[PDB]
Amino acid sequence: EADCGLRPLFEKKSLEDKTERELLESYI
Amino acid sequence: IVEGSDAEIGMSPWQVMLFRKSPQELLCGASLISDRWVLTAAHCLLYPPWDKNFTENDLLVRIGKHSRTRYERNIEKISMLEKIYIHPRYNWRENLDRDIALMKLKKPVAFSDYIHPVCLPDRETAASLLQAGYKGRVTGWGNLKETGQPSVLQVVNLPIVERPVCKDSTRIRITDNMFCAGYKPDEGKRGDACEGDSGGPFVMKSPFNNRWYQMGIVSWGEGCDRDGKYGFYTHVFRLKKWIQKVIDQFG
Amino acid sequence: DFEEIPEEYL
Ligand SMILES: CC(C)CCC(=O)N1CCC[C@H]1C(=O)NCc1ccc(C(=N)N)cc1
Ligand code: NA
Ligand code: NA
């Protein structure tokens, strides 16, 4: 699907969840 | 999920609960990958050592949920199965190699704030993200400990482990269709999937396009959150050929 | 321990 992986209550509103940054910081 | 936290509302809108018709109970986790297809672990449906063999009509899929036990009116959707597809080379006799199954819903589910599909990885995303030390996220309503059920969906972030450490942690024969994740005893932090989390997703958020991808399926583990042991996950990308075939030739 | 689901889902 076109829209997969984009959560309505987070990415679609440019809101981050409380721990997604932990994942990003591990992607070195 | 051991040593996790309560999920936020809408944090995992691809999370699916596999639910028994009678007696009514959780059987497993699962994930939504389009408006009519759900991904889970083969052992959720077929596991002869435990006399487990479920058919379409034994089961329902519940989507959009947060609460484990509650019927979440106006929010969850409950869907019937049209057909179950298990990997033809799923190895239930030895080590759960190719622990993967697809379920086709009787009718499409309506997407919503709480219901939305996850992406499946292409080769380049898989190559970039499936690296030792990179963290993914696992969700489920399974046990909080190996002896204890949560009120709501739980979440835990865990680092992928290098293949030699995975192998040296167990006597089971590990294959290329699996990966393991979890903290080492030396690392401090902990957490793990557990019974009832089976078939649920291990996801990563791609830093290239900011989409969530399902890289693994909760498959097996020896105890839960034991020092020196790691949870094992079906490697979704490795089995993509089969997934595509099934959806292409049955959708 | 599970809230009963609406009868129509069987
Ligand atoms: C044969 C197999 C390699 C070991 C037993 C095993 O784990 N089983 C045999 C049948 C299904 C699976 C299971 O119990 N999965 C549930 C489970 C257990 C532990 C964890 C974990 N990450 N600790 C996750 C899922
Ligand atoms: Na070993
Ligand atoms: Na461990």
Side-chain angles (χ1 to χ4, degrees), chain A residues 2-28, chain B residues 1-69 71-82 84-228 230-251, chain C residues 1-3 5-6 8-10:
Chain A
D3 204 31
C4 64
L6 303 169
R7 301 170 289 173
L9 295 177
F10 289 95
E11 288 78 24
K12 301 214 205 297
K13 289 169 132 106
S14 202
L15 291 181
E16 285 171 21
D17 72 50
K18 292 159 165 269
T19 63
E20 54 172 277
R21 173 135 272 148
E22 177 182 5
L23 313 181
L24 204 227
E25 292 173 347
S26 72
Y27 303 160
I28 180 44
Chain B
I1 303 297
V2 181
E3 285 307 291
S5 305
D6 291 359
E8 287 175 67
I9 302 314
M11 199 192 210
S12 186
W14 36 82
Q15 184 70 38
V16 170
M17 176 186 298
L18 240 171
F19 187 79
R20 204 178 182 161
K21 279 183 181 179
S22 177
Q24 286 193 179
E25 48 179 29
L26 175 138
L27 284 173
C28 265
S31 65
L32 187 75
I33 61 166
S34 73
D35 57 28
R36 254 190 104 156
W37 287 95
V38 171
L39 187 61
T40 190
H43 83 260
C44 286
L45 302 159
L46 173 56
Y47 192 66
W50 292 353
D51 285 305
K52 183 197 290 152
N53 198 157
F54 290 101
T55 185
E56 290 68 6
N57 308 125
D58 296 330
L59 316 169
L60 304 148
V61 150
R62 299 171 67 176
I63 315 166
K65 289 199 47 72
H66 183 66
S67 180
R68 175 175 67 79
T69 48
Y71 171 66
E72 294 180 285
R73 196 164 40 96
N74 288 15
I75 297 173
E76 75 169 279
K77 300 288 166 208
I78 302 192
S79 287
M80 290 169 301
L81 284 329
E82 174 210 285
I84 286 166
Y85 302 88
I86 300 200
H87 199 105
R89 306 181 67 192
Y90 162 49
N91 189 347
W92 48 270
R93 298 183 161 272
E94 191 194 344
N95 57 359
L96 257 30
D97 198 15
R98 313 183 192 84
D99 192 7
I100 186 161
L102 279 161
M103 303 174 295
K104 178 159 220 262
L105 311 179
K106 243 170 230 199
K107 344 252 270 232
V109 63
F111 299 163
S112 79
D113 280 346
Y114 317 99
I115 304 182
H116 198 89
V118 69
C119 306
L120 296 183
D122 54 45
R123 185 166 343 249
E124 302 56 69
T125 300
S128 184
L129 295 184
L130 283 181
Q131 312 202 218
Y134 287 28
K135 292 180 185 177
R137 177 178 282 171
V138 183
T139 41
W141 293 276
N143 297 348
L144 299 161
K145 138 80 191 203
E146 18 177 346
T147 312
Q149 287 104 242
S151 166
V152 303
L153 191 64
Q154 301 286 297
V155 186
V156 73
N157 301 332
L158 301 171
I160 292 168
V161 174
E162 324 86 272
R163 190 145 302 254
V165 177
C166 291
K167 283 176 156 154
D168 281 356
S169 74
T170 179
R171 302 172 67 167
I172 302 303
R173 174 177 73 89
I174 305 320
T175 69
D176 285 349
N177 304 305
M178 319 167 174
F179 64 89
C180 88
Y183 290 101
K184 324 193 169 176
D186 93 72
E187 282 171 320
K189 309 178 71 141
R190 55 196 314 118
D192 196 5
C194 198
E195 170 181 280
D197 293 322
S198 289
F202 181 101
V203 302
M204 303 181 83
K205 177 167 178 169
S206 174
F208 303 100
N209 64 183
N210 303 121
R211 295 175 184 251
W212 292 88
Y213 283 86
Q214 181 174 354
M215 311 304 299
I217 303 168
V218 177
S219 175
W220 66 273
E222 300 168 271
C224 309
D225 196 44
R226 288 184 198 170
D227 268 29
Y230 298 93
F232 286 82
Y233 301 86
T234 307
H235 187 323
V236 166
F237 178 69
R238 287 264 307 163
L239 299 169
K240 211 212 199 323
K241 285 312 204 222
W242 174 81
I243 293 157
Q244 262 304 143
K245 175 180 144 225
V246 171
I247 290 162
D248 282 342
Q249 76 150 279
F250 280 114
Chain C
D1 186 23
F2 275 86
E3 186 161 9
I5 62 188
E8 98 268 64
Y9 300 119
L10 15 138

